[PDB]
Amino acid sequence: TRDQNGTWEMESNENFEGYMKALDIDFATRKIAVRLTQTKVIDQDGDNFKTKTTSTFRNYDVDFTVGVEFDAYTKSLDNRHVKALVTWEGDVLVCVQKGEKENRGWKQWIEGDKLYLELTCGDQVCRQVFKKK
Amino acid sequence: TRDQNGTWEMESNENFEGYMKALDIDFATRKIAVRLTQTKVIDQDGDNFKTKTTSTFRNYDVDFTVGVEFDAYTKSLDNRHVKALVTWEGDVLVCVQKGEKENRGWKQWIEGDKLYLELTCGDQVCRQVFKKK
């Protein structure tokens, strides 16, 4: 069949590294790219093609119990070891990440159909907002 | 409430770069990472949390008509200009990307449940296999 229509999910990717190296793609990009899984959406009408390609990688599951300190390795970010303790302040989830970096933690709360996550390290605060799907 | 269950899709990510810089993540990695958006799935049972975060790049829309030449930049890869021509060879969609790199192109075809994509540059071949979502 010539019918390539569909939403296609990558199951195998062999020698992406060698291909990217032949394109002189820099190491920082390759180190990330080799870890990615792709979704390709193809809309095809005869010889007319529209393709939409999206790269995703799965962050490492984070499981915890409020009130119980746990060891965590921040592999999705800086890959450091922290001792995390999550507690409630009202209905706000508050985490202190004890470790090498000073003043490191986060807090997470809901307002309406939105989730807010503020991450802090030192004098820097990142505010993330999510919408419920 | 103290109920954060749900699938949460990122709407905004303020000062992600500054926070990553405070965590000593390198500039090249930061410049890639700020292009990401996240989906966060939270399964909460009382004070027990299981969280699953997925980061996604949006790449490269590519549209073309078989048999019609088109200039493009390979923005999701090395960002080089190629003049591409896609033709059919049997059921195989064949693309030659004329440009600075020798023997550059790709081939895409369907076998049953699966889409095959072979990328070539020079003496390097990358084979990708996708399955329907």
Question: Can you tell me the distance from the alpha carbon of B35 to that of B58, in angstroms, rounded to the nearest whole number?
Answer: 8
Question: Can you tell me the distance from the alpha carbon of A26 to that of A30, in angstroms, rounded to the nearest whole number?
Answer: 6
Residue recorded with tokens 């005869």: A46
B110 neighbors A3 (Cβ within 8 angstroms): yes
The beta-carbon neighbor of A11 closest among B77, B119, B131 is B131
Residue A39 sits at the chain B interface (C-beta within 8 Å): yes
The matching CATH number, chosen from 3.40.50.1240, 3.30.70.240, 2.40.128.20, 3.60.21.10, for B1-133 is 2.40.128.20
The bridge status of strand A124-132 relative to strand B6-14 is antiparallel
Strand, coil or helix: B83: strand
- Where would I find the H helices in chain A? 16-22, 27-33
Question: Can you tell me the distance from the alpha carbon of B77 to that of B25, in angstroms, rounded to the nearest whole number?
Answer: 22
Resolution (A): 1.8
The beta-carbon neighbor of B77 closest among A23, A48, A88 is A23
Question: First-to-last CA distance in chain A?
Answer: 36
Count Cβ atoms below 10 Å from residue A82 Cβ, excluding itself.
20
Question: Can you tell me the distance from the alpha carbon of B126 to that of B106, in angstroms, rounded to the nearest whole number?
Answer: 9
Structure-determination approach: X-ray
Question: Can you tell me the distance from the alpha carbon of B110 to that of A1, in angstroms, rounded to the nearest whole number?
Answer: 7
Residue B92 sits at the chain A interface (C-beta within 8 Å): no
Residue among A86, A104, A110 with most chain B CBs within 10 A, to mutate:
A110
Domain map (residue ranges) of chain A = 1-133
The beta-carbon neighbor of B59 closest among A28, A53, A119 is A53
Residue recorded with tokens 């010539």: A2
Locate B113 and state its tokens: 């449940």
Burial class (CB in 10 A: 0-12, 13-18, 19+), A126: buried
Question: Can you tell me the distance from the alpha carbon of B23 to that of A120, in angstroms, rounded to the nearest whole number?
Answer: 10
Locate A33 and state its tokens: 């790219």
Question: Can you tell me the distance from the alpha carbon of B46 to that of B41, in angstroms, rounded to the nearest whole number?
Answer: 16
B115 neighbors B130 (Cβ within 8 angstroms): yes
Residue A130, min C-alpha distance to chain B (Å): 4
Residue recorded with tokens 């090249």: B28
Beta bridge partners of B126: B119
